[PDB]
Amino acid sequence: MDSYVEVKGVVGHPVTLPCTYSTYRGITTTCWGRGQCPSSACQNTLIWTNGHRVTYQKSSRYNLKGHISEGDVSLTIENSVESDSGLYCCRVEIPGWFNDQKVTFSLQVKPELVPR
């Protein structure tokens, strides 16, 4: 099953990429990247967490507004544009060798109103 999460946002409003993981084994790091999830960490990194808070954000338009320490690492791109459409990668570094939780998103931001 080679498949990704489809996400749809409308220009001018914030679009969210839902990404979560269980902390049943304790807190952990996460990176966000533009482009598909590859092998080792994220490519075109947008975000990095230390486990409790964001420690790296490529731009202020990228924010994790959920309870990060609870397991909610969802990415929120403020004021989306057609420009944001593309693949996104959410990687959760879980225990084990070459074993990260990888989720690729396919985002589409279209205008909410196309004229008359």
From Swiss-Prot:
Possesses an immunoglobulin V-like domxain, a mucin domain, a single transmembrane region, and a cytoplasmic tail containing a tyrosine phosphorylation motif. Interacts with STAM. Interacts with SELPLG. It comes from Mus musculus (Mouse). Disruption phenotype: Mutant show progressive loss of IL10 production in B-cells and with age develop severe multiorgan tissue inflammation. Mucin-domain deletion mice exhibit decreased phosphatidylserine binding and are also unable to produce IL10 in response to apoptotic cells. Specific deletion on B-cells results in spontaneous systemic autoimmunity. Residues 4-104 form the Ig-like V-type domain. Disulfide bonds join 19-90, 31-42, 37-89. This is Hepatitis A virus cellular receptor 1 homolog. Belongs to the T-cell and airway phenotype regulator (Tapr) locus, a single chromosomal region that confers reduced T-helper type 2 responsiveness and protects against airway hyperactivity (AHR), the hallmark of human asthma.
